[PDB]
Design a binder for this molecule. Structure first.
Ligand SMILES: CC(C)CCCCCCCCCCCC[C@@H](C)CCCCCCCC(C)C
Ligand SMILES: CC(C)CCCCCCCCCCCC[C@@H](C)CCCCCCCC(C)C
Ligand SMILES: *C/C=C(C)/C=C/C=C(C)/C=C/C1=C(C)CCCC1(C)C
Length: 227
């Protein structure tokens, strides 16, 4: 069907795949138990993204939703990806600063809410109500970011310098990249329809690769994953 955005879905497919393979090869060679746990989690992240990117490329995960007097193209496949990838990334961060079980539960719960309401909003047929779900989803995102910035950064002060320094960089990459998603959603096809789907796809691809492969390289190349 040659939709304008396929080139970005194809490029995201390739980068997510390359990233996954490389992390897989690199993780299989490691013998430290703790480093292996980080490797399995981190490898799974782009592996999942890969499948969803490839599916969308082949014409799946796309549904037309009515609102604003138009049949708007909505890629729901993105939420099936993010439902599992975002909490795994949070787990990597939590294991890094040795966060408590209660903290992890709250972050994942908040993450599930962010993705769930995000998807409900992306499927809502009442234009103005789309933004109510988006508002609720962004709020949950802000809760998560608050915890990583105020809770975790504090927690990282119990760890060695290199562990705290690695966490700060990953914390900063996450805060910057994650905060951008709601904005893209708002001005894109899911929201105000200002930015075209092809460009929107290009934007999500850059953020996704960065948030997963970029994040992954930073973490797995560090000495912080060793027990
Ligand atoms: C009209 C043009 C029809 C052909 C379009 C290009 C088809 C080949 C490229 C896309 C393919 C499927 C997606 C993944 C591509 C990975 C390419 C190598 C990355 C390394
Ligand atoms: C020692 C091994 C430590 C790592 C074990 C695997 C961690 C990643 C897989 C499990 C994760 C959490 C549960 C849900 C996994 C969903 C995976 C994608 C399903 C599609
Ligand atoms: C690999 C994917 C990552 C790191 C995805 C992060 C996605 C977000 C932080 C998404 C946030 C959203 C909102 C705040 C509100 C509207 C809908 C979402 C799900 C796009």
């Amino acid at each position: 069907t040659g939709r304008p955005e396929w080139i970005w879905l194809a490029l995201g497919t390739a980068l997510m795949g390359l990233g996954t393979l490389y992390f897989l090869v690199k993780g299989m060679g490691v013998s430290d138990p703790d480093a292996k746990k980080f490797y399995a989690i981190t490898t799974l992240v782009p592996a999942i993204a890969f499948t969803m990117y490839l599916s969308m490329l082949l014409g799946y995960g796309l549904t037309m939703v009515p609102f604003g007097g138009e049949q708007n193209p909505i890629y729901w496949a993105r939420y099936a990806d993010w439902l599992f990838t975002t909490p795994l990334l949070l787990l990597d961060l939590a294991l890094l600063v040795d966060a408590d079980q209660g903290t992890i539960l709250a972050l994942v719960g908040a993450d599930g809410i962010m993705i769930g309401t995000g998807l409900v909003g992306a499927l809502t047929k009442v234009y103005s109500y789309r933004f109510v779900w988006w508002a609720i989803s962004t709020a949950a995102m802000l809760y998560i970011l608050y915890v990583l910035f105020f809770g975790f950064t504090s927690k990282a002060e119990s760890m060695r310098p290199e562990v705290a320094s690695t966490f700060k960089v990953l914390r900063n990459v996450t805060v910057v990249l994650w905060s951008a998603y709601p904005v893209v959603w708002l001005i894109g096809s899911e929201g105000a329809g200002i930015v075209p789907l092809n460009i929107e796809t290009l934007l999500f691809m850059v953020l996704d690769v960065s948030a997963k492969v970029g994040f992954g390289l930073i973490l797995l190349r560090s000495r912080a994953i060793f027990g």
